[PDB]
Symmetry: D2
Subunit: 255 residues, 4 copies
Amino acid sequence: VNLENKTYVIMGIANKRSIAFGVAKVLDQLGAKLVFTYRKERSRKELEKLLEQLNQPEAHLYQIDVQSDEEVINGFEQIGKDVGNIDGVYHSIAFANMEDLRGRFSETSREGFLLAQDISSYSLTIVAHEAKKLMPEGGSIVATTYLGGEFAVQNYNVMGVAKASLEANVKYLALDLGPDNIRVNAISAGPIRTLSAKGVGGFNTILKEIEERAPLKRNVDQVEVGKTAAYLLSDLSSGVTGENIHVDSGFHAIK
Amino acid sequence: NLENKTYVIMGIANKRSIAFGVAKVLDQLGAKLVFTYRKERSRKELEKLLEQLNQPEAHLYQIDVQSDEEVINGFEQIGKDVGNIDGVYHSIAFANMEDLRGRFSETSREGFLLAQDISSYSLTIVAHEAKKLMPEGGSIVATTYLGGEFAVQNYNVMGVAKASLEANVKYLALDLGPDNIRVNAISAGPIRTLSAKGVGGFNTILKEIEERAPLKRNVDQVEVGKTAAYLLSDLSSGVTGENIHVDSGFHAIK
Amino acid sequence: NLENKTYVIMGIANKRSIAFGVAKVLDQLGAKLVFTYRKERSRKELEKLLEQLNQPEAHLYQIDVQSDEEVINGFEQIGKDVGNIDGVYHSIAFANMEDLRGRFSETSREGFLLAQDISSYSLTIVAHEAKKLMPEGGSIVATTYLGGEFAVQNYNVMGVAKASLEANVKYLALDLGPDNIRVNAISAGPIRTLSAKGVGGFNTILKEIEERAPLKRNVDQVEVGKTAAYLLSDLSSGVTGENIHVDSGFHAIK
Amino acid sequence: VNLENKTYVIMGIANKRSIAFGVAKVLDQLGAKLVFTYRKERSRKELEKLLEQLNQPEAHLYQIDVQSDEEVINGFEQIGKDVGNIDGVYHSIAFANMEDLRGRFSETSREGFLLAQDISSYSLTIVAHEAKKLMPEGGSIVATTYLGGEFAVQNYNVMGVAKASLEANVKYLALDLGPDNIRVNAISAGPIRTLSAKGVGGFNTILKEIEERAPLKRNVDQVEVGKTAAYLLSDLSSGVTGENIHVDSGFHAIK
Ligand SMILES: NC(=O)c1ccc[n+]([C@@H]2O[C@H](COP(=O)([O-])OP(=O)(O)OC[C@H]3O[C@@H](n4cnc5c(N)ncnc54)[C@H](OP(=O)(O)O)[C@@H]3O)[C@@H](O)[C@H]2O)c1
Ligand SMILES: NC(=O)c1ccc[n+]([C@@H]2O[C@H](COP(=O)([O-])OP(=O)(O)OC[C@H]3O[C@@H](n4cnc5c(N)ncnc54)[C@H](OP(=O)(O)O)[C@@H]3O)[C@@H](O)[C@H]2O)c1
Ligand SMILES: NC(=O)c1ccc[n+]([C@@H]2O[C@H](COP(=O)([O-])OP(=O)(O)OC[C@H]3O[C@@H](n4cnc5c(N)ncnc54)[C@H](OP(=O)(O)O)[C@@H]3O)[C@@H](O)[C@H]2O)c1
Ligand SMILES: NC(=O)c1ccc[n+]([C@@H]2O[C@H](COP(=O)([O-])OP(=O)(O)OC[C@H]3O[C@@H](n4cnc5c(N)ncnc54)[C@H](OP(=O)(O)O)[C@@H]3O)[C@@H](O)[C@H]2O)c1
Ligand SMILES: CCCCCCc1ccc(Oc2ccccc2N)c(O)c1
Ligand SMILES: CCCCCCc1ccc(Oc2ccccc2N)c(O)c1
Ligand SMILES: CCCCCCc1ccc(Oc2ccccc2N)c(O)c1
Ligand SMILES: CCCCCCc1ccc(Oc2ccccc2N)c(O)c1
Ligand SMILES: N[C@@H](CCC(=O)O)C(=O)O
Ligand SMILES: N[C@@H](CCC(=O)O)C(=O)O
Ligand SMILES: N[C@@H](CCC(=O)O)C(=O)O
Ligand SMILES: N[C@@H](CCC(=O)O)C(=O)O
Ligand SMILES: N[C@@H](CCC(=O)O)C(=O)O
């Protein structure tokens, strides 16, 4: 897994604790050129500060709010003009309203339900469609999911149904883009202390249950999602598509 | 035996609807049935199809599941008219036709979100409203397709809406379980219906089922109805969060 | 309604066996019932338990499923005595107690193979022999546990046997499907039985079900019985190679 | 990856086309010390000739029939004494009688059935038990499976039920050895032309179906399984255990 002469777009860094910064440090250390997308100007300010830890000689930064077709379309097109063709996209983007990450799922509003779908699942479909234009030789696209996608986890609620939708999105994109040699896959990460994790009810007690109950008896971190991302995004994983790799101390496998 | 049971059946359009197969089976088991419909033609179709059933009266409500208010008022009127219900059969899905053929990666945001709204979110607001009519518990069944579990050619945006539906069922089962409301899905094999005409490559898939599925034949609406009767009755009292494939065994092979 | 149906039920040891749950329900629905047992003690228990059923006669056959000869002769004798049958409920498993606690990685070879033989292989041979007694179709159900789908502390050698049993169901479904023989599984939640007493950590699991599973209660043998009746009747036509969890929704959550 | 100063045991090379030789070329390229185990004297012969293609400076070959506890126990003890501690095991071993790999599964004999379980699933348990003693610090164990363990595949019959058992074995071993920092996983390989594959009914038909239907529209090869093995056997997959990674052109993800 030497990645010199590769270029990857990383979507969804907000600060030093983001899962996408884990990916970024791993890829950067393997020699990749990196392009970052963000939403909030605060995330750009964090990226400028974090970029000083990386070996990248150039800040390639683009504001993409994935709710806007125009911004995705113009964002990727612009990326293609500044760096030319890419080898892969790491997608690390989800959002739901805090009301909807606690209490009763049956009480979820239409607008909350569709908001999480839009940002957390559809963004992947239109990103694949646009990033595909920069991968005429093929490449690799990886999104971040959680076990809540496969089973009902108390409190994860509307996000779990968005992650179900995302994981199917990965399977349908993989079938669609396979003949173009673009592999599509998901990493199912265990709980990691990030900014978004702060909004999820019961997150702390899940972290503890992982330590007690998961095969490795410990929580995973961002760099460990990064290591698996490096695998998924490179030729080491050349025959692998439509797959979901749980980076979660084995927790998915037990009951 | 379903006498003194009352069930709301959403999503009959014509004689071929999966929901009419459920209706005949419940009706034949002695249940009292209430029906919900979107289009005017389905009311008309319904009024004529009801002559085949045993129902001594025609309890019909127009509900478009895209409107909260219609679902809310609908179920409020059902309560006022009929009393407490024992369950809900949800047989509703939609996507635009261009989205059911060609490249999934080309799906529009509108088309993607439409399908989620009608095909997945609707179960959630239905379950919320119907719960008010089930104070001593009941049973909610939704209809899905193997396409929510695996990427099936052409099924595209509906596959991702079904994956969403199937998780919606799990989260509702967890949430509503303490109220003794069970929520399950029937994953139906391919059956010729109004909507089935709209899915790219449906005929080819029909034939593959007979060639390749363990039972070597296709299923029909009455077979979905029979498993609905199970899920909606006390025979399934211990079962919730489940997805039962009524598909000649096709899910189990590869 | 199962009048004029005949089912073989394998693996009743006493009044708490899951298979007795199945028996009561089928008996209540009018089925003619044949029983198989291994231990002397289990026949005695069976003779007493029949006084609770409407079975007008006692059809008891000793079959140790470790013996090909006993399964072949047992089923051939059942055919001479009652004619064609409509299906088989398989409620048989076994492992040595030291393989239901401690470290899985320390399982012996004979212990591993013993559990496979009795708990999984036995279905293949029963299905072969019983096929002979169903020229017209039927239904075969085996009993499994969620520890065949996930690693569950202590369940150890039996979980690997259940993984193998649930695959056995799928291959039998595929093989016997053209013959109109359906093959399915019930994945039952924990239930206090004689066998359950030898599994490390059983009470802990039973209690976690009440706290964590969607229905927040445990299931019992009669609820297994009820889903068994569905899977063994025409209500489940079109369903084969399936695993239905009767476990209060525990399988759907994490 | 980079595997210098790592030592791996590879079980189940028969000839140049064995999946396990794919695994060996990739690890050897990456700097690992390799120890090889075989059953037939013919496999040892092949092994000795295939070693000239490899960078290994030293042949470490051990006869182990996994039907015998003593050969497993003694084999690993001797490996122990000869090379010191090891970093993981690649398990590439299965067997079923020809009788049982075609026609009707319901006709499978008890002896055929238990034979497939004993060699194809139990072997992993005892290997893991014996290999653990050589991994005081942790390590990684990988077994090779096939999609017919998750779904009924026509003709794969008794071996399907053995692969189910194997895939459960991997989860139960992951739960058990996790606290020792030993990870255990499976690679679900797509159809590959091997000695053993010649005895499976309908194998050519499936090859063709993969090319027509699988997302990547092509079959995979031994090196592609090797490359995912290097991922699983190395630190890149820290955090991953009890997992099954399909190297099969996305075929598992579609219906
Ligand atoms: N932490 C965990 O335990 C965990 C576990 C499993 C999976 N995941 C998944 O990991 C991914 C990364 O989340 P995280 O935990 O690392 O949280 P995070 O650091 O808060 O990152 C989430 C990112 O989502 C971006 N985002 C939200 N809406 C967006 C929009 N409309 N357009 C563009 N970007 C948008 C945010 O950008 P702005 O801040 O600039 O708005 C932010 O950078 C998510 O997909 C999450 O579901 C997290
Ligand atoms: N047929 C199959 O092979 C198959 C297989 C597996 C699963 N399914 C599922 O079975 C269910 C029923 O479909 P079907 O095949 O029986 O086709 P159908 O007869 O065309 O029924 C679809 C129903 O959905 C209703 N519907 C659509 N949007 C609605 C809305 N916004 N509000 C209220 N009702 C709405 C339609 O009502 P109007 O026409 O009145 O608008 C129609 O009654 C669907 O969920 C489908 O996904 C079908
Ligand atoms: N209880 C639970 O929580 C639970 C949960 C999930 C699934 N299950 C499954 O349910 C089934 C029934 O078990 P149970 O809990 O009802 O326990 P049980 O009452 O103790 O019954 C187990 C039966 O297996 C029979 N059996 C064992 N070895 C046999 C052999 N060599 N030949 C013929 N019969 C043999 C026993 O007969 P003899 O007494 O004559 O030896 C006994 O009747 C098993 O498959 C079990 O794995 C149980
Ligand atoms: N080829 C495929 O399409 C495919 C697909 C998915 C998974 N797999 C799996 O890949 C693994 C390797 O098989 P393969 O396809 O590479 O075929 P292969 O080259 O024939 O290798 C199978 C190996 O199994 C060994 N083996 C069998 N019984 C043994 C015993 N009792 N003790 C020790 N070794 C024994 C054989 O050694 P001897 O020659 O010395 O007897 C041989 O080296 C198997 O687990 C297989 O199920 C294969
Ligand atoms: C009850 C479950 C607790 C464990 C949750 C782990 C986790 C933490 C953070 C996650 O990321 C988001 C969650 C909601 C909204 C946006 C994001 N990025 C996320 O997707 C998953
Ligand atoms: C290539 C796949 C062919 C098999 C499709 C079977 C099917 C048929 C009808 C279905 O129902 C709908 C499909 C789309 C839009 C609305 C509905 N109700 C549906 O959800 C599934
Ligand atoms: C640690 C897991 C706790 C829950 C176990 C539930 C259970 C209980 C009894 C079961 O039946 C047997 C178990 C072992 C040996 C034989 C049988 N019949 C069985 O198969 C499963
Ligand atoms: C009907 C579907 C055909 C596809 C089979 C692919 C395959 C090929 C070879 C395999 O390896 C064995 C199979 C049987 C016996 C021993 C081995 N090693 C194996 O395990 C799987
Ligand atoms: N802050 C709470 C959730 C808030 C609640 O709804 O009580 C937690 O993380 O546990
Ligand atoms: N498991 C119970 C047995 C109770 C009984 O069967 O008497 C105990 O150990 O006391
Ligand atoms: N009899 C105890 C012992 C636990 C064990 O050591 O297996 C139990 O059932 O949990
Ligand atoms: N050698 C034949 C066997 C045919 C059969 O499965 O019986 C094949 O591989 O196709
Ligand atoms: N990767 C190292 C450490 C083991 C582990 O990843 O658990 C090895 O295989 O030696």
